[PDB]
Amino acid sequence: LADLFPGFGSEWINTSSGRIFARVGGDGPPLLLLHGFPQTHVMWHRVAPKLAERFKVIVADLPGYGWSDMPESDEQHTPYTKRAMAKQLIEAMEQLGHVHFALAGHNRGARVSYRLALDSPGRLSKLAVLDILPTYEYWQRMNRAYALKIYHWSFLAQPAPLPENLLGGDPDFYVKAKLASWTRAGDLSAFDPRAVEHYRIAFADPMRRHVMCEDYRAGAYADFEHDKIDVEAGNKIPVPMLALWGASGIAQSAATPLDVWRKWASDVQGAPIESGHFLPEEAPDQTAEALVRFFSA
Amino acid sequence: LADLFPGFGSEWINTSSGRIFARVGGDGPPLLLLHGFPQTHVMWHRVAPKLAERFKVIVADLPGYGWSDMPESDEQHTPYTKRAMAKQLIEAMEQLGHVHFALAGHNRGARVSYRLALDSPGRLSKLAVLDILPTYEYWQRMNRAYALKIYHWSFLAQPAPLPENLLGGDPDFYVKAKLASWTRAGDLSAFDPRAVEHYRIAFADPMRRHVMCEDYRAGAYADFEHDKIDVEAGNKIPVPMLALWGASGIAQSATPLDVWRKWASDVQGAPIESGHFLPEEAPDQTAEALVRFFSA
Ligand SMILES: [Cl-]
Ligand SMILES: [Cl-]
């Protein structure tokens, strides 16, 4: 497995729920980067160096993902709810002395990120979310067209062991197909092959795949309910916020992303990127420039 | 594989789209029985003897299922659309000299049946649909709760080869879990083990599994478009119709008779205490309901 972060250290950070693995590089204001599914921290490898020119950059594996420890789940999928993941990453940042930091997330990590902003806004100086809408908004849009396009939201949320059993037959095919199907190109050419191997290796482990399913089960249940409380209360994120999305990604598919996020946040700017879902890899230059400019201001 | 229709003959019926396998028994007015997913014609084995006391009973494998031939599909999943399947089964019935017949279907076969009634009503004396709503109504009801309860419609409709590759690793596990999941009790006790073996053997064939996925792709695309045309035009089935559903089945997740009254001008209906698989979970009540409907 390649080292894709020149000049970054490697740290295991202790928390009450298990270790968080992170690559750590740079100096200056702290910035945490959170990946999603079906990836690991390495999906930031093309934009993290540019950010580390200006920031101390912490590139973390989500709880249960990558090389982070896997806390034991329960019938309500608690440790893989975004509320719990955010609490665990808040603990990890406190181990480094960071109680007020910038945060960017993609896919599941962006769900941790906006849930963190809603629960604990004092932790965040600025927030960027990449190619997502809130979990509540995806479910409210779950008509025929969306049920077909993001079928995995219902499939991976089926009770164990149905998705685990299906994924175990040919996991390499599944992870590679999901990566490719959400790129503008439709193949793996937007990814560094060494990064794909990181994703393939993690996805090859049945315990890691079970975590992913627990994450999607939380996404169908507790995460949805948590979001629903905020919608009904009219709670908006007060943290200065950036919403990036791919012109052909998931978030734009049944909604207008900036219009949606303005319903969830009082200080949000946005921009489309010529890209599929995987902005930091398909469009590293535009993504890095947008993030550097946002987090510097 | 067991013979679950003692006394019934066996026919391989040529059509322009491929052979239809059927068991044939009884005597009287002709009655065609159509299974669905993930089953074969044998799921009628508990009700077919009683029906054969009153009707000439034709128990057919759907195009591409069981022992029927598997036409090559295309970009629109055409041979596995219910419109195409209905045309093919009309041809098969004509080979037996049946140009006007009674029809009962379950699951995918019930979808063939109501599409047949919409496209070619003159072919049917009476129609029964078991534990289904129209495909359009399933999709229109799509929301979070629906998507989580009946996920396989969107999963199996993903572009090839995604569901085929996932199903290929351990096919026995998936078909047995699907059968059990939709019964009242949630296990396999409602099924004759010899019938389960028929379903398992069919599902073990990758070509048969691809047909099933093409069927669900049709169900997400052309079948839905065909239904949408009819409901937006206000076209109703004029054939006298029976909707039977399981109190713990798939169709009721909606008020099925009220749904069907929007699609049919002469429909009656009743629930039965059962999961989805009415002819196996509740054979006596299903057989009686069908005998009384088709004999009236
Ligand atoms: Cl996501
Ligand atoms: Cl239905």
Curated annotation (Swiss-Prot), chain B:
Molecular-function GO terms, alphabetical: haloacetate dehalogenase activity
In the record, the note on similarity to other proteins reads: Belongs to the AB hydrolase superfamily. Epoxide hydrolase family.
Q: Which reaction does it catalyse?
A: a haloacetate + H2O = a halide anion + glycolate + H(+); fluoroacetate + H2O = fluoride + glycolate + H(+); chloroacetate + H2O = glycolate + chloride + H(+)
- Which Gene3D superfamilies does the protein's record reference? alpha/beta hydrolase (3.40.50.1820)
Which InterPro entries does this one have? Answer: AB_hydrolase_1, AB_hydrolase_fold, Epox_hydrolase-like
Q: Where is the AB hydrolase-1 domain?
A: 29-266
Q: Which PANTHER family match?
A: EPOXIDE HYDROLASE
Record has Acyltransferase as a keyword: no
EC numbers, comma separated: 3.8.1.3
State whether keyword Transcription regulation applies: no
Which residues participate in fluoroacetate binding?
A: R108, R111, H152, W153, Y216
**UniProt keyword annotations, A-Z:** Hydrolase
EC primary class = hydrolase
- Report the SUPFAM superfamilies cross-referenced here: alpha/beta-Hydrolases
What protein name does the entry list?
Fluoroacetate dehalogenase
Quaternary structure per UniProt?
A: Homodimer.
Chain positions of site Important for enzyme activity: D131
Q: Which domain of life is it from?
A: Bacteria
| Protein task | Catalyzes the hydrolytic defluorination of fluoroacetate to produce glycolate. Has lower activity towards chloroacetate and bromoacetate.
Q: Which residues form the active site?
A: N107 (nucleophile), H276 (proton acceptor)
